[PDB]
């Protein structure tokens, strides 16, 4: 189970890294009513919360 | 309208408040003594076409 948890956390960190790259290269979709920074932060927070929930 | 996205977008555009400041990118003031011509070469073509 520890290897599964580690793999899930690593996958989530890789996803966050990809989101960071997309935001830094203007490839990130913008949630309506929110700025680029706000959308980026919301997406990262959602990804990390899903990571913790999956590992748990 | 509730079940059609296009009409809903039309209504949304019709409701939202929009002012000149929203679309204006920059403003400038120039000195130009000839009402029938201009000093700026870039805008010269458009103004002369309008006057003709």
């Amino acid at each position: 189970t520890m290897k599964e948890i580690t793999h899930a956390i690593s996958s989530a960190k890789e996803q966050v890294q990809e989101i960071i790259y997309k935001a830094q290269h203007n490839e990130l979709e913008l949630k309506p009513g929110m700025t680029l920074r706000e959308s980026f932060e919301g997406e990262v927070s959602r990804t990390l919360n899903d990571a913790r929930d999956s590992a748990g | 309208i509730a079940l059609d996205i296009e009409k809903a977008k039309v209504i949304q555009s019709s409701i939202e408040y929009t002012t000149l400041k929203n679309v204006t990118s920059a403003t400038e003031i120039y000195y130009d003594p000839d009402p029938t011509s201009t000093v700026i070469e870039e805008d010269f073509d458009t103004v002369e076409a309008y006057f003709s």
Binding site: Q24, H25, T35, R37 | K21, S25, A26, E28, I29, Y31
Partner: protein, 111 residues
């Protein structure tokens, strides 16, 4: 950039000659008057981009807290570079990176 009187150092204000139909810059504490070269009396930018890339110094490569990357420099083609995001920090600022080489210090992007 606006000019000043060459003998009073005060600010020169734009003026129009009715008889000559010409734009002039005239001081108010003195009779000095100089001919205007450009017709752009006043300009106001509703959306501006200055302050985004202007924040550059020659010795930015001496900061140890700045991350170091391996992006290729268009000018020097060095293997070592330092990157940072926009210095302008408005709430709607883009997150694009500006890369500075250690030899030519040219600012460029990955776009």
């Amino acid at each position: 950039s606006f000019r000043f009187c060459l003998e009073c150092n005060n600010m020169l204000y734009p003026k129009e000659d009715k008889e000559n139909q010409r734009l002039l810059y005239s001081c108010r504490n003195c009779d000095y008057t100089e001919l205007a070269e450009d017709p752009k009396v006043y300009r106001h930018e509703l959306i501006t981009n200055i302050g985004e890339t202007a924040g550059i110094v020659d010795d930015i490569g001496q900061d140890p807290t700045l991350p170091r990357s391996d992006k290729e420099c268009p000018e020097c083609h060095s293997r070592d570079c330092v990157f940072f995001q926009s210095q302008q920090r408005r709430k709607d600022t883009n997150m694009t990176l500006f890369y500075v080489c250690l030899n030519c210090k040219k600012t460029f992007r990955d776009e």
